Design a protein around this nucleic acid. Structure first.
Lengths: 362, 362, 362, 362, 362
RNA sequence: UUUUUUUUUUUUUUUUUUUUUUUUUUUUUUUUUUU
């Protein structure tokens, strides 16, 4: 009857507001960050292969190198386009290949290097020298190495970006907490690669990536759109296939409570007949409809500092949050989720109901 | 049938009337309030950092200083634009950096200061001296301070503006009543900051802000639009993140009764079958439609002296107001809302119904 | 079918007729009523403050003084404009500040006074003397008065105009009947002001205002447009905000029956199925449409002698009027509305239905 | 299809014909009827006040006197203009104030009188003498009379013109039939006036007015336009409002059948499905459209001998007239309307239907 | 498509033809018919009053006398103008008042008479003598007669012209057939006049008028334009309104079939789907458009011998005429219209349909 | 060929207004596991 139209869609109104605000704040530093093109991908892959075959190398700039691989795989104009869509005021320090001369210990030698505002030909040739030394050492004691053991093979950048995906998985919390689980998974898979190569320091690579993402954030959006584009394609090697599964596994972070609530719904937890949640039913329905409307680009918000993610938190609905938490904990799956309820009574009640309901499960 | 068009939209008619009145009253004082630009933000941030690291400093002009930070972050032309939209007759006393000479206790020293019609180089250098003294004292007994303990770090203005948001939350009542809850929340959060710095007098900062807002009101609109613009952006630090959540938490003040009425609706309180509210159903529906039409810019009205807010008060609908109050109190959530009903009988009846309905909740 | 166009819009035809009549009657007295400008507002506010702080003063010309405050706040040209729109033939006796010399009891003293065709410097200095005497008396027995206790504060004219709004509320009846309710409300609010000052004689002020409005009517339109303009603004204090709520509360006088009819509609009173009102349905619909078309400037008609208000009276529809009256009385809200129905049977029937319907209200 | 344009608008054709006839008949008597101006209004009001305060005076020329008041309130040029628009051949015997000398019973006294072609200074001084005598008698037995009891007050002419409006109400029939209802309505109100003054002979005033309107007709148009102009104004008193309501109540005389037909339509009387009225539907629609087109100046036709009023009579549509009559009589509101139907069967049928439909009205 | 322009407007072509024929036939008798002016109207009215008050007078020349009254009311120049527009070759025998001497039975007496080429002073004085005799007889047996019983009153000519209008009503047939209905109506009205006077022989007056119109036709056009001019005026009495209504009632004679066809259309007679009338639809539409174009001066054609009236006869459309006749007769309103159809089958069919449709009328 | 009957219009009731009433007032950052 007439009551049905008594409503208030504060969420939609906030959305409209933040979408149309008429004003803007600016930093506009004016940086001149680099951007390569399709050409130097081969040199970069060879470099990553050297840095992989070499043992115990200081995997410091590895995350940077992988981001450069990504930008080269993408394209100058496309990178610039997404950056301008993101709203930046930066420039394109074009990259250029060149030879470097160095009288190494009484020998003039040619050295393939790239001009950059962040790299140094010194460390480049150091890397190349160490790779050459341990590579000839590897040639010793067997006579020859396979093609799948040398820097020339093409899967190196994808191997690094797999770890990058493992890190962007847990960057939601992003406090160097999930490093242990990251290492655990990276050893659970990639065993073939860990035996085929040796310059694999997962902890060091992850720390490097953490530093990179903590300082320069725009690489986040870069890597995101790169992974999305790579997934949409159907081409690539075995590593590219695993990479896509890993990347997509990190969909929908900072949104777990919604799915757990759907879970407790599908289990038919009795406690939802309580008036204290039957009230909030309306608003929770409305936010669910909002998420359904947004559809695709919904899971990657909390990855970023996108301000519209705060809407999708049921922490403001304490009774609902607490009952869902109690249900999931009674199911014995909330391993170490450092959350908290509000109505401890409802939490304990739902937990007791669930554990009672499971043991007598036919 | 024919009865459906018997209507009278007094609210819309009042809206049209006040929108088009043909006349205006003016004060037009002719003040020459200052306005900085993007340049001096660094000096101001350093100043706020000094005033933060220093202990037990008289946080008197801190609210003013934060407003100056805000105007500098915004822009001269934008501030002037919003002021003219607000309908002011003021001028732009441009700010200028300069050095000040002072033979401090037998030593001529240079002193970074800004010409202003509100500030004094004397108190500026006093602040700087006190900061330097306690900073070298902090350098004692440890040997060195971290970069996150010195005035040079960039989060100071945002730290102050967080408290500013906590204050504009309760400025709706605006009688220095919510100061206790403000302090409570400011200690519930910002514990990291309270340990990282020491010049934190929340009560004093809040009193300063109260004085500032009580005297000069235009800073209200300034701070509002500033927070809105900052929220719409996404590029920010952790402090900028917390600030946006805090600011948005103060959306929709002086409108709580609408949401509580929606609550009592969603609970299906039996008492709304009463004819004495079935009558007023029409007008309450109409005002709800008006609010839905206005959409976004609806919650910030009561923050201001905007005259159109008086429409959105259901106090003129006594039966509806009383039943909603009784329902919410029966739910045991109306903590200390100093309201009053009219039909005490309906109030008590709804409260009894609700408390009866909760205890037997399955 | 063809019957739908059988119609007769006597209301619209009367409207057109009275709008275009080709002739006019004139009085054209040729008065020289005064008009100040923005300058003397401060002196007038100080005068009102004196007349407020002084005790038991004969609040005789207070309504006149408040109207002068209003004209000064408005502007000479604007007052003249609205008067010419109202169709007057008066002149502008310009006001001028000056000093007056008077050897008070052996002392020559200067006296701030304004030349006027209504005021006298004698009574002006009498007021000032009494204010000074009781002000120094107030300074006794405490040592000092606060700034919010002296004539210098700026809220005096608004304080008077609040009572003016309370009076123009009930001026529709305008027979000195609502004075009791006026006093009741004026004591229900303004308690802070009644304790902060003492020259508050609400009955005397109201009688003064009644005399003023009974004699000079043009001040009615003046005060109306003044209140409208003040409400549209936002820059104001507590008193200014209260004033606007009070003024707007008097919207739509002599039109209560329409809203009560809407009420009885929303309650679905069974008696409207009667043919004796199903007939008049058409004309009542038409007048409702006329009111909806006029929209804003509809509620202030009965305040004035505007001749077009007689249309908006359902007294000519006796059956409808009587049923609405009976319904509202059965709801027990028609307190003392000295009205009368025509069909006493329908009146009693609707009342019985309503009271039957309320007691069994679920 | 093609049938829709088979039409014949005899009404419009008659209208065009009578509007353009090329010829004219003339009487052109050449009278020299008087016309005053704004000056003598005060003397005339004093005279009417004398004739009101005096008891049992022969209210013979009172209607004439009121018409003179009206012409004085209007203006010489305006009266002449409307008369020439009406198509007269008369002159303007200008009025002039003067003193008259008369040795009353051994005393020479001055007597304010006006030269006129219809008045006599003798009867003027007789009136003044009688007023003076009973006025001093009224001064006896109380000591003093109020200002609202003497001839000097300004509402006398309006008091007379109220009765004039009551008479022009029923002048449509204009056979001295409605005198009883007129007296009843003069006692329904004006009770305050009947107690405040005593020279009130409603029957005598009405007979005087009847004589005046029966002889001189042009005063009809005069009084009409006067009332219209007075209504359009707003500046007035209680008597002025009363008068306007009374005057407008006489709008639309000799047109009641149209409104009663609209009534029977809005009730949905079943009998209109009869073919014998479905036929005449077209012409009745056409005349209704004609009336809607004329709009405003439609109700005052039957007041005059304007020849175009005969169009707006549904007596020529016997079936429609009879069914409407039967419906209205079945509603029990056609009190004493001395009409007649044609199809007595349809009349009785509709009456039976209506009375059947009312008693079972839910 | 192309077929729409296949047309033939024989009616318009005949109209153009008869309008422009280039030739003329003439009689040009050269008569010297009289014409009075405004002066003798009073004498003529007195004469008619004598001839009315006198009993059983031979109302032989009464129609002539009334026509002379009409010409006197019109004007010499205007009569001559309309006659020349009608295309006559006559002269103006001016009328002149004079006294006649006659030694009546031994008494020389003065006798008011007018020189005329049709009248005789002998019969004039005979009329006057008879009037005087029966007038003094009327003075007997009551003592005095009222002013509304003597020849001096002014309504006599209008009283005669009312009967003249009743006759010109039925002159369309003009075979002394409608005399009975004429007498019936003349007794249905004018009862007041029939009791107030006695020289009223309606049959004799009508026979006189028939003779006059049968012999001299130009008086027809005279009387027509006179009635039209009198109707357009408004300044009149009861007899004038009566006369105008009567005159206008005779509008549109010899055109009844058009209106009856419109009637049968508005009833939606099924038989018009027949192809035999769907064919003639075009031409009947065209003549209807022609009549609509002519507009006003359309109804008075058949009154005259104007040759253009033969167009407006649907007798040449036999199927349409017969179906309309059958419809109207089935409605039971074609009382005694001595017409005839052509398609008797269609006539009977439509009649049966109509009478079937009426009895079952809801 | 054409035309073809019926008929003046008006008629009752009635000024309008009339009550109650400033609004605000509470709590709250969000994220956190497994593949």
């Amino acid at each position: 009857m007439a009551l049905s139209k008594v409503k208030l869609n504060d969420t939609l109104n906030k959305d409209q507001l933040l979408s149309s605000s008429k004003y803007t704040i600016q930093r506009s530093t004016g940086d001149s960050i680099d951007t390569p093109n399709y050409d130097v991908q081969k040199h970069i892959n060879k470099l990553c292969g050297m840095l992989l075959i070499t043992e115990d190398a200081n995997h410091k700039f590895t995350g940077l190198i992988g981001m450069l691989y990504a930008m080269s795989r993408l394209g100058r104009e496309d990178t610039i386009k997404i950056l301008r869509d993101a709203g930046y005021h930066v420039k394109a320090n074009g990259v250029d290949v060149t030879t470097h001369r160095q009288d190494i210990n009484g020998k003039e030698m040619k050295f393939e290097v790239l001009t950059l505002a962040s790299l140094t030909t010194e460390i480049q040739i150091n890397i190349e020298i160490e790779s050459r030394k341990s590579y000839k050492k590897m040639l010793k004691e067997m006579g020859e190495v396979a093609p799948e053991y040398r820097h020339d093979s093409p899967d190196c950048g994808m191997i690094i970006l797999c770890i990058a995906a493992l890190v962007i998985t847990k960057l939601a919390a992003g406090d160097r907490s999930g490093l242990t689980a990251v290492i655990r998974r990276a050893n659970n898979v990639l065993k073939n690669e860990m035996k085929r190569y040796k310059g694999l320091l997962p902890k060091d690579i992850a720390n490097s990536f953490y530093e990179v993402f903590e300082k320069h954030p725009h690489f986040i959006d870069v890597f995101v759109h790169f992974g999305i584009a790579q997934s949409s394609t159907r081409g690539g090697s075995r590593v590219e296939g695993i990479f896509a599964g890993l990347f997509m596994n990190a969909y929908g972070a900072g949104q777990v409570m919604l799915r757990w609530g759907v879970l407790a719904k599908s289990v038919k937890n009795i406690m939802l007949g309580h008036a204290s949640v039957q009230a909030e039913m309306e608003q929770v329905v409305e936010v669910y409809e909002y998420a359904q409307k947004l559809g695709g680009e919904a899971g990657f918000y909390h990855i970023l500092n996108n301000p519209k993610a705060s809407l999708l938190s049921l922490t403001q609905f304490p009774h609902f949050s607490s009952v869902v938490l109690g249900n999931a904990a009674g199911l014995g799956i909330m391993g170490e989720y450092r959350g908290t309820p509000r109505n401890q009574d409802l939490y304990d009640a739902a937990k007791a109901y669930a554990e009672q309901l499971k043991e007598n499960g036919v």
